[PDB]
Paper text:
This proinflammatory cytokine is secreted by various types of cells and strongly augments IFN-γ production in type-1 helper T (Th1) cells and natural killer (NK) cells following activation of NK-cell cytotoxicity; thus, it plays a critical role in inflammation and the host defense against microbes.
The IL-18 structure essentially does not change on complex formation, maintaining the β-trefoil fold that comprises 12 β-strands (β1-β12) and 2 α-helices (α1-α2), as previously reported. Our previous NMR study showed that the residues 34 to 42 are flexible despite partial α-helix formation in this region (residues 38–41). In addition, two isomeric forms that originate from a cis or trans peptide bond between Ala42IL-18-Pro43IL-18 in the loop are equally populated in the solution structure. The flexible nature of the segment produces a variety of architectures, as demonstrated in several crystallographic reports, including a loop with a trans isomer22, an α-helix with a cis isomer21 or, primarily, unobservable flexible loop with a trans isomer2022.
Author numbering: 1 to 157
The structure:
Amino acid sequence: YFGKLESKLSVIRNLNDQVLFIDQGNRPLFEDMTDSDCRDNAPRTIFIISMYKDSQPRGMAVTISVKCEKISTLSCENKIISFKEMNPPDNIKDTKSDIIFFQRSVPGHDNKMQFESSSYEGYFLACEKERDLFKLILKKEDELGDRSIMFTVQNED
């Protein structure tokens, strides 16, 4: 079971320094943004990372939320990434959740993070280029040192 500890404002970037954002169709996308662009698109680029206590510790348990039309929380339900209209809850009864990800620092860096699905072991949050768009997806670790599943969390310490 999970218990909410705190919620903090953060900006998420891939290894190309492209910042994670919610577009008009509520799609989690990645694009090149200066500190100016990032500031002008603030409700769509500022994410709420909520930290949870876990009765079965196996990585920093987190939810990822954003304020658009309403508070939306990131879900990997049926191994598909989407933002569902809900607040990060105070308590989660199971040992697995479609909105709970395990945040881990990549041994290569103190900056680089990875987000593994609690409900789908071996599946990670990833940036994948589809046509001319950089999309937030859920995938199995394709290879060792895969940069597509690595991110930076800017919470300014």
